[PDB]
Amino acid sequence: PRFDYVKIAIASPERIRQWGERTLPNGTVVGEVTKPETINYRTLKPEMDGLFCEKIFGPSKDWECWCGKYKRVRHRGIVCERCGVEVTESRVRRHRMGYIKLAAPVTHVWYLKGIPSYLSILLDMALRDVEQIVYFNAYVVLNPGNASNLQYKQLLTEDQWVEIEDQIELEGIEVGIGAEAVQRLLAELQLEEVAEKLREEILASKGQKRAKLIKRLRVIDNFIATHSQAEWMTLDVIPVIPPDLRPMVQLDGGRFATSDLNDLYRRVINRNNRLARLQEILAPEIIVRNEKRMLQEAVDALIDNGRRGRTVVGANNRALKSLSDIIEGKQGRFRQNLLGKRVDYSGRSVIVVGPNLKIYQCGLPREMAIELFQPFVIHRLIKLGIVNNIKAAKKLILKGDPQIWSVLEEVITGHPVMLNRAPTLHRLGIQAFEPILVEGRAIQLHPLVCPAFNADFDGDQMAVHVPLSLEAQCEARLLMLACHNVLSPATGKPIVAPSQDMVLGCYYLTAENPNAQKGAGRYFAGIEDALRAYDHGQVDLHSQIWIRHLDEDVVTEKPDTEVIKTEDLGDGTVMKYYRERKIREGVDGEIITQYIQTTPGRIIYNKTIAEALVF
Amino acid sequence: PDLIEIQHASFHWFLEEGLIEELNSFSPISDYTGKLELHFLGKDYKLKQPKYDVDESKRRDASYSVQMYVPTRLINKETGEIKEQEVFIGDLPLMTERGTFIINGAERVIVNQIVRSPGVYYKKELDKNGRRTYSASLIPNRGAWLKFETDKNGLVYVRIDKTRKLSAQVLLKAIGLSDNEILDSLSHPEFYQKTLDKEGNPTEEEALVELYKKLRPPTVSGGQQLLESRFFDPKRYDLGRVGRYKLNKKLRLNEADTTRVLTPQDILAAINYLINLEFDVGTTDDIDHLGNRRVRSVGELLQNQIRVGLNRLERIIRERMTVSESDALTPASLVNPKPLVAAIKEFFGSSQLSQFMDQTNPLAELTHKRRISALGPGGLTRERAGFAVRDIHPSHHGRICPVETPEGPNAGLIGSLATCARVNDYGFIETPYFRVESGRVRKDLDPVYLTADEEDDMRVAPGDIPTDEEGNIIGESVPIRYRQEFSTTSPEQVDYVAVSPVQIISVATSMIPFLEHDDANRALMGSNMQRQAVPLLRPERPLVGTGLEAQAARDSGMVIVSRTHGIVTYVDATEIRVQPHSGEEIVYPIQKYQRSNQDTCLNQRPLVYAGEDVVPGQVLADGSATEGGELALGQNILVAYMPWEGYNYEDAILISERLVYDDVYTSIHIEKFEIEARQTKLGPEEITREIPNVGEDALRNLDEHGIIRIGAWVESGDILVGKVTPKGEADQPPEEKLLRAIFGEKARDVRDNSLRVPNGEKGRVVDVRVFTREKGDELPPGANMVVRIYVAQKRKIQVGDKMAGRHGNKGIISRILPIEDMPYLPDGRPIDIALNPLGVPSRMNVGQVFECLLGWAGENLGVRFKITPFDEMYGEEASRDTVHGLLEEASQRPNKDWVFNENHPGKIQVFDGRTGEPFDRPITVGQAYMLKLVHLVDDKIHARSTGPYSLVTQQPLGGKAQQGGQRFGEMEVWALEAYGAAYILQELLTVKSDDMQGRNEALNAIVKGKSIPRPGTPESFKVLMRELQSLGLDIAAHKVQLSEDGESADAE
Amino acid sequence: AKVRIDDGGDTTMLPGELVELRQVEQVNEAMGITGSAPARYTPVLLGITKASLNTDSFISAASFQETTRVLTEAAIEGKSDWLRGLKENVIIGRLIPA
Amino acid sequence: GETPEDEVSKNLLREDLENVLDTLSPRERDVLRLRYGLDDGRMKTLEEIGQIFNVTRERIRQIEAKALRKLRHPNRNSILKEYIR
Amino acid sequence: KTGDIVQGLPRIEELLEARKPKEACVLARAPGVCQVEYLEDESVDIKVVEDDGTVSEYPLLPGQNAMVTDGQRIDVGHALTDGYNNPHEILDVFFSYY
RNA sequence: CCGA
DNA sequence: GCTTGACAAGGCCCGTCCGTTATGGTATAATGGAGGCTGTCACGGATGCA
Ligand SMILES: Nc1ccn([C@@H]2O[C@H](COP(=O)(O)OP(=O)(O)OP(=O)(O)O)[C@@H](O)[C@H]2O)c(=O)n1
């Protein structure tokens, strides 16, 4: 569907339970994971309450219950009365999530051990003190009533608390430890009262205190605008990811391939069930206190492994990948699967040089082209009445036929193809070409587009991509075709220009050479006369040649406009001499003729320019 | 000397003396009751014969191992019960005659690791500008590190590996030394007594209580046992032989070498040196100097892994003795060999040091065994690799080659041992030098082999100084290196000189002729490409070489070398028989068309005939990239440095068809295919001839069991092994149900699972070995039978193949011309290859023109020259004068005077093959030695329409082996965004990856010729949404429409 | 582009907040039409990493760098992403708005 | 999972199957469609066709038998014969 | 050091990240400078006096810095010493002056 | 480990 | 264009039947853990300490 915006917030326990709970027609919710079992070892089926359970997450097969008896497709939207598994398609295990109901409150490690550690900001305490209370190393005073030596949010050791028990003072003094104390401290904080106290405190305070008051006030003002409670930073319910995002597949050899998220959830469920067992049978407090600290360290390793304490490792002391580790890095979800993907209808090969081949044309190998254009060939083989379905078309494509090559030749005509060479440092690293079928295995590249790709022919490979839609073919032709990409986008200067052999060939063609002077100083009646004399073998390539040429757009090295000498002729005619020109003009208002000293190679160069441009 | 002598000497030291030290530090063990004692007799340990040899272990995917039996003896403390029994202790893989190991059917080498040597090291770190403060570090072979400190006030602070700083007087009184001998041992007691007051002076009992307060109920007996267990106990602290040697050397002690523990005299001497360094006497150490770095080969690493496994084994034996109250056991019941086998298998399988072997050619095989890597366990981390550890040190001169190094991210980390280098008994690299007396190079006896004893002491000259024969060093200035500085001195002050001008370089760099006329990066590229050449069908020796080719071919191990004098009596293509004379027939087996690790050929050919005398050391058979007993990696072909019609434009290569029809550059590649008939829960997989949906003539090459025969031709898609598996779901859609209602069509219970040839990969079947458990074999568990198929193919030269010379001049063939179109010489001979002349002066590899001109002179003479590098010691312009003089002498032949022109020396006239006209300028022709590399176009071409997908992301896979797609990374997305092209980018991200309904709809619309519909939400975004929800974040998408907000369901 | 706020008089802009100067000027004019006391500011210069993380979109800032901190401050501030830019529509799967 | 090629092949097979079946008599076409679930997604027995109609299940088996015999004709039915694997 | 892009590109990165270099000292008003130097033996302090105010400002200078001012009309953000300028101080000086 |  | 009767085939369904599986227990005395770092560099906050 369509949506307009995405909003992020803090999840309440009722919202986490709302993601996981699903009701049955009998009147029973099924969303809670209570056992750390995954699948049965004998038959490879998921267990009836666990991390892969079919009552919570859905069936493993399409339209089939767990216990049997509903194997057909005809029972749709029904729930089995014996087992409890809804007879649905098996792709709901990508979406359906569950939850774990904790026996003790736990803190989210993102809000405690981050920077700037919003829990200690909102609680107005130091980070080491809150980290000492949460991990059961110190107490805190929740009720400071009837004491002068005790105050609110004051930390005590175990010795200081057992020596307070000497006085049994003579009133009700409460203490707390763990995330229960933090949840009770956050639950009794009146947000509007602390906000108006901070606004009444900032106007009359010091300099460095005021920045801390501004930071606490701007943290507190977010909790009133979002209408979220401060005690939601401590977790009572833990959401469980769907089982198809933590898959457990079997390799050829009998060994199972698991993901690291199953071990972390298994540790959380094991320590939760042991904590419930210890609280049921009234164990001593040193054993129940170590079990709550271990559950606290288990939830933190599932969320962010190695953020606070020791990193939980696996088999070869490799750290387990957690819920933030699968998204937070350059191998995470954003940089590896969302901003860049692997694509269909693509291939690659080594590149060779492509002379006697135009620009906007790439040489595409034939065995590469039957694979990339396979559904377009399959469509044409049915439209021409050769075959009738996809199976006969695929059979004739793989078996080899001379009909397939003519079909592919008439299919790839006018279909542009994008070429790419890594690294793609700028825009000209992806350009579109019109393919022609070459024989061999390398891709033939035109030599003028090689500085745009930074590509030479000593081992470079290029990827090939085929646009499918008609909007995608019109965009490859009108916006990305290689004959429209002459100018750079960084400067205004042309990228497509001769280089490294055409420059040397044009330098040799138009140079001066005193050794090769055959027929030097001869007079010719224009450009075509000297071009005919060169192909007849009359002159050399660097001979000094006078050319009758009436145009005045002549540019030379160190351009001359001054007259060297003048020889006067009869009938009022002046013969003006230049360094590389000879102009005969009339007396008053006319020019008669003009000769230019040049080489035949310069004449070849200018004839090439003139027949290339004016057409 | 041999070139793989470090591998051979280290494994011989392990088999002779290294394991005995572990078995002697092992014994004896005892129980906690003190009534049983088990001790291992290590000196008489036995080795069983291997179950299979080299080739039968290679083809069975097994190891080449021996069984190791250590005889034990159980003595009894209640009565005179002596129980002696041979006990199996583990499986040790044996080093082959080439210096390699065979682990799971693959050849493997254990590369040499360079680490910091044990001993005491001092450094001088400082503040902003602050005080010159000095710090010590005592490094053992194994155990805790003892460090020392000085601050700006001057406090001597000692610390253990991770702890905070405490005082050296507290450590010294914690040992048990008197305060008398502490300040009576020191040279300057006034500096130490300054720290005595601020830190205080404890008693012997008062000091033991305050280390336990810092290292960890503070007790003195617990801290005494703690420090006795850290530094002074065996089997928890080993200083090592090299550590004792270097610590006696630095601190000038004559302590006995048998003591391998730390003593308080050593700590007193280290305190004395650290205090004396604050009064400007003594020398601070260098961490990158090759006197402080040693090489650990395969003996030490096996010794350490066996130590760890024996620690586990004796823990198991002590637990089994302490639990069992009943006595009178057998020694074979108390020994569990499984941790030692597990440790040895872990070391040989999953180590950074145990590397998959480079077996492309003999040069790559020889170079891989001499690699010196700084990475690994106990070495370095690539993230902790700065610039100074990748720099070239002056102590590397002669010992480590400055040229040969990787070009990738591990540049400067993995080095190569130089040619004349050698590792001594303590692990340090030494180089031979000739003595120089009164300005005369001595050269009378063996050289000295200085182990970096030549920096602070000797003036060493290189081996390219001019010197008249049987005489002094000519010239009044000799270039020397001294105190890690280059300088020039008189010849009467020179102490040592090098023995060879190629002492600075490795073997593959010494293969390059005219090396001093090339750039160093191009020499690196030439060495790297020389290690990547494929062995050709008819190998040929170079017309210009250097001289190390025969020794490289002898020490690679691909050459059958004779051992005795004798007369060869019988030679065929598989066997050479010779009776020795100076159990009277030596049979040398000759291997025929075996497969290397890189799918190349390992073939040997006989050279000797029947009935001729044979000297020991004579080459009897030569290998795949070897002919005439010398290394032969490529062929000699006729070059012309000229541009064609854009066909050698930007390092492209134009060749002729003569290199195709004359079988030049034709190589053999053998591929290997393996299939297992596994055991499934639904039934056993069987290998059969009856396959469903397979026609009539697709089974001609299969035998009666469904397997191909030897000598059959296979192409892409042909069946190699027919296999079926019993599918058992049988969930058919209504379309298939109606189509089987109409036309009969009984659906079978098995499905096709046959082994087929991949796309391409045609060839001939040469080996169809089948392994079955009831034939005597034993398999991986869960597999009934295993079939292994070897397919060989002859690959000719092709457009798109890579081609290179010895000077870093690579290139891709882009056109193959006929010989009537190739340019030709004034005797009518056409050119084999045209190279672009613009690739020479920009890349600055001038030695290829020297090599081609000298090879062409040797072609016109017929002499096969050999020139050592750095030949300018014999005069100015020596290479140029040699080349042009030999070209003149080749042109003085009675029929060949067109070979050399005195007006333009290196060039002659070349005619065009198409028109007959000569080119306008003379062209440099020659005979170059070109190579064919492993990078062929058949292994590079790949294409995908639609294949498999990933598990969670549901995006296409990657890789050629799994029909994967190309990655359209983030830079390509930026390039498409810098254009317009919003629709190309949208179809690249949705209907070509991880949108399954869009995939099906796009394929159906293309096949039926209609418009492709609009895509939906991609699959990986929903995965990200579920992951962010499972982290505990209430993230949701919303939609606004006519004054209404509603949460949208993206899972739909 | 940005500016730092101090003297937060009669405005919903606490000190320390990085706002664009055009937005502070629009708020100052549209509250100076009511004759109220405006907000002072001092201009700041950010680097290319701090200006990338101080954008209005948490999806782009989370996909760029420091995903945990950006997602924590976005979850506590309760902010919305209105999908205005090239990087968000690539992640969503839509046509880019260029 | 199932490839997009198998999806498009079975969809073209479904379209060609419906276009072949709607050429014969309208009664036998829907009998064959309700028999194998080409419209309901539920394969039914012979009697429940007799409750869709009221004529009982013995005529239904003869109807589907002669419909299969008409679709098994060699002439004008080989468009579906290429899907034979 | 050597001149190539390996040494020029860290300058680009520290310019685009708006970092602060080690040595920098700019003016804080727009005065009319007249140089006074008595002894250059590792002790130089630059004297400069304004036009509008009676109280003058003379920026003190530690010995490793030098002087580039030879006498001109010094404006607000002018650089008096040698060293890499930081744009934070330029923005601060201009805003605090105007 | 190598290639661009 | 249907209809009734014979001949079998095969899913549901409720008994035993034996292999698997969960659970409880064992009585000399035993009472604080092995096990690696120790060669990267630079910047920005956040303590923390004199
Ligand atoms: N670590 C590397 C190495 C190489 N490249 C790419 O590969 C090309 C390497 O070109 P190559 O042909 O290997 O070397 P040249 O620069 O052409 O030099 P030469 O002709 O001497 O080989 C570079 O332009 C670069 O774009 C890269 O992206 N990353």
Ligand SMILES: [Mg+2]
């Ligand atoms: Mg290249």
Ligand SMILES: [Mg+2]
């Ligand atoms: Mg190149």
Ligand SMILES: [Zn+2]
């Ligand atoms: Zn059921």
